[PDB]
């Protein structure tokens, strides 16, 4: 009853207990203990759910603290603004560290281990996602480079996806969903956003109608598309 095996079981107890930081740790043990083989679909999804929950809690706090700093800076209340920004820096710091940890793991182990179109697009989309979270709060030269790394990763993901995966594939559909959110929200370019989202939705519709979760993601492209045409 192996180390890999027991770490995966612990990661799943951590997921039930909602101790996501521990879940991340157990899955990195798994991931750093692999030779030439890659993570199973189950293991990869466990690592991804762990990081997503560790980063989402901080993104949720960052939005809250940021909406407050803006209301308060708008009433010209300077002492509260310093207190709020200092709180926000603390949070941005945890966001940089969390991203740094999954981005290093992607470049060092995951991406080099990706042997099929499914896993390649999965890890490249992930790489695009964490550089994008860095861009949501960064501001200058830092924002420009996070935005550039984002665009580069999504494009590499889309090249593979477009040619090796079905348009109804959830990973390809999720890539299109996140890539178009990037155009809309980081690049403030609503037109490239709508175009990319609609093309992916249509191609999926086309395939479903001729060749036969992909359902949930498509509802999400539609929800974003209408949200944006407003």
């Amino acid at each position: 009853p192996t180390a890999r095996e027991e770490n995966v079981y612990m990661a799943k107890l951590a997921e039930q207990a909602e101790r996501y930081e521990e879940m991340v740790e157990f899955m990195e043990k798994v991931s750093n203990s692999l030779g030439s083989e890659e993570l199973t679909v189950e293991e990869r999804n466990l690592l991804s759910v762990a990081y997503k929950n560790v980063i989402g809690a901080r993104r949720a706090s960052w939005r809250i603290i940021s909406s407050i700093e803006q209301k308060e800076e708008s009433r010209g209340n300077e002492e509260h603004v310093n207190s709020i920004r200092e709180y926000r820096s603390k949070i941005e710091n945890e966001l940089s560290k969390i991203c740094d940890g999954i981005l290093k793991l992607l470049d060092a182990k995951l991406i080099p281990s990706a042997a099929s179109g499914d896993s390649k697009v999965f890890y490249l989309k992930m790489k695009g996602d964490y550089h994008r979270y860095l861009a949501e709060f960064k501001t200058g030269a830092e924002r420009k480079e996070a935005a550039e790394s984002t665009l580069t990763a999504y494009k590499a993901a889309q090249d593979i996806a477009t040619t090796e995966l079905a348009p109804t594939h959830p990973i390809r559909l999720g890539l299109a969903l996140n890539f178009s959110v990037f155009y809309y929200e980081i690049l403030n370019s609503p037109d490239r956003a709508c175009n990319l989202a609609k093309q992916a939705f249509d191609e999926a519709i086309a395939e479903l109608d001729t060749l036969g979760d992909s359902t949930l993601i498509m509802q999400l492209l539609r929800d974003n598309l209408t949200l944006w045409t407003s």
Binding site: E185, D223, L227
Partner: peptide, 5 residues
């Protein structure tokens, strides 16, 4: 904020 997965 838009939906992502």
């Amino acid at each position: 904020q838009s939906y992502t997965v």
